Amino acid sequence: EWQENKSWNAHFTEHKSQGVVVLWNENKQQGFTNNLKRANQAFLPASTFKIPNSLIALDLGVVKDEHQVFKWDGQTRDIATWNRDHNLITAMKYSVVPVYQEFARQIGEARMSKMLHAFDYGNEDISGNVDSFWLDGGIRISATEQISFLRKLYHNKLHVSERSQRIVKQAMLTEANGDYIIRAKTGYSTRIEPKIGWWVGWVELDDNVWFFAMNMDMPTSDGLGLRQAITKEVLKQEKIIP
Amino acid sequence: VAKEWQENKSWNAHFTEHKSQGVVVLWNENKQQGFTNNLKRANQAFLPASTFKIPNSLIALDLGVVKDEHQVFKWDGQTRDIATWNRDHNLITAMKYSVVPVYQEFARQIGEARMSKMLHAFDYGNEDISGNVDSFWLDGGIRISATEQISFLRKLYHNKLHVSERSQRIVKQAMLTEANGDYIIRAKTGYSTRIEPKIGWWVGWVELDDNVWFFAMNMDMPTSDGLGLRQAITKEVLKQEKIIP
Ligand SMILES: *C(=O)N1C[C@H](NOS(=O)(=O)O)CC[C@H]1C(N)=O
Ligand SMILES: *C(=O)N1C[C@H](NOS(=O)(=O)O)CC[C@H]1C(N)=O
Incomplete structure (x- = not known):
């Protein structure tokens, strides 16, 4: 089920970086990684x-749809x-x-905790602030657990409406x-x-889906572009993308 | 410039230079304003x-002829050119x-009565399904203009078509060409x-962060040599209009 393919380290090494790329071939039901x-x-x-967060907010009606306008609070931020x-x-x-901090507050601790349990999301521990636990709280998830979670989302198997799962997958659209x-x-x-640094999701091909989850040491914001760059080098090496 | 429809003949350069003739029709969703090289x-x-x-995809999903976007439609075994x-x-x-x-089979399963009812409810072109149930859109009575394609596409974009929201979401996902x-x-x-x-036709839309540009283009296609011009001429117009880089 899980093969270690150490050749992908070359992609990390060539980029003065370190981390993990995890791939899942949906058709074959087999996983590959440079570091188990x-x-x-x-x-x-x-x-x-x-x-x-999007899934829970949509299912609870905190987010009506992908057109609902979430007004800027007027606070000028770095980004x-x-x-x-x-x-x-x-x-x-x-x-x-x-926007996501507001969703989390509207969802609230109780529903966030119990709904994440329904997703079997990582350690399912929301300890810390309702609006920041995913950044500085107790929640933890591995690259293989991200894949497991994403595979359920892809198949509409999470315990939320099909509609909410479709809207999120649409909102996840990055490249086509x-x-x-x-x-x-x-x-x-x-x-x-x-x-x-993280990059999680999947690549849809005509006759297969390749799920991916990568993380890499990100001591500074300088190497952020490498999250996609390294993943893409792995996909190209494996002939998933040309 | 405040008008609902504006003609921009400068776009004809994209057709002429490509030894082509046609129409590109754009609709700025935010401004509720249309643009074309040929009214x-x-x-x-x-x-x-x-x-x-x-x-066809919308009707087939709404009627349950197509369960979902994963349902496999088996090859009939006949070898075709494409x-x-x-x-x-x-x-x-x-x-x-x-x-x-695959689509001919959908139309046959949908049947003429449901196909006709659906197109009238969609206000799809002239709503005329005359001819073969499985070919009317290629050699039958159905006629639709580039502007009527946009009208139809705008309803689909907003989930305003009479079929299920789900069928509309699946069709828009199935329409994904580039992102x-x-x-x-x-x-x-x-x-x-x-x-x-x-x-040749190219109908659809461009989603931007804060706007949607609907498009419908058709052009004379005497030979398959110009097939790539459907997207290429549209893109030249979209680039001229600063819609896409
Ligand atoms: C998410 O991890 N964050 C919000 C924002 N995301 O940009 S990212 O998706 O490319 O990583 C900036 C980084 C981070 C944060 N500072 O909270
Ligand atoms: C659709 O008009 N057709 C099926 C197929 N479509 O390819 S296209 O979308 O690029 O136009 C080939 C042409 C045409 C047909 N022969 O029916």
Whole structure:
């Protein structure tokens, strides 16, 4: 079920980086990783938590649909794209923290905890602030647990409406062309060490789905582009993407 | 400039330079304003050909002929000219490779009575299903203009069509052509080859962060040499208008 393919380390080494890329071939029901230990190492999900947060908010009616406008609070933040009104699509695209913080507060501790349990999401521990537990609280999820979670989302098997799962998968749309479709979410766990970068999601091909979850050491924001770059090098090596 | 429809003849450069003739029709969803290089051709009704895969997919999902976007539609075993058709398909791939046999079967299952009722409810072009139940969109009575394609597409985009919200969401997912950090294109190509004038189609929309640009283009297609011009000329217009980089 889980093969260790150490050749992918070359992609990390060539990029002066370290981390794990985890791939899951849906058709074959087989997994591949350059590091089995790191693949099962649970980390703070950071912005990858916007996937279960969106799902819960949609199912509870906190988010009516992907067109609902979430007004900017007027607070100027470091990331320029957050300093405007957003809908679910753009909030996911620009990883708009205050929008997701508001969703989490509206969901509340009790429903957030019990609904995440329904998703079997990582350690299912929401300890810390309702609006920041995914960044500096007790929640932890491994790259293999991200895959397990994403596979349920792909198949509409999470215990939420099909509609909510379709809206999130639409909001996860990152890239598409004649060769593949990528539905994914980036993350950057900046608050608690080890500071890590995430990229979780999948690649849809005509006749298969390749699920992926990657994390890498991110001591600074300088290497953030490597989350997609390294994953893409692995996908290209495995002939998943041309 | 405050007008609902504006003609922009400068776009004709994109057709002429490519030794082509046609119409591109754009609709700025936010401003509720339309733009075209040819007002007359924008309203000229043609056979929808493969663009009919959008309403056909909608009807088939709503009626449960297509359970979901994963349902496998087996290859009948007949070898056809377009290689990609000679294999099993789901709604995503059938739309992607415009697999005619799959859609002919859908239409036959839907039947003429339900097909007619659905198109009238969709206000789809002239709503005329005359001809073969499995070919009317290629050689029958159905006619739709580029502007009527946009009207139909706007309702689909907003889940305003009479069929289920679910069928509309699945069809828009199946329409996914291209996506990146700047835009998302949800569209369907067409090539009306049976009844003159032989024409190429490209209908759909461009999703931006804060706007949607609906488009419908058709162009003369005397040879398959110009097929790539359907997307290329549209993209030249979208680039000229600063819609896409
Ligand atoms: C999410 O992890 N964060 C919000 C935002 N996301 O950008 S990212 O998806 O490319 O990682 C910035 C980083 C991080 C945060 N500072 O909370
Ligand atoms: C649809 O109009 N057709 C099926 C197929 N479509 O490819 S297209 O979307 O690029 O136009 C080939 C042409 C046409 C047909 N022969 O029926």
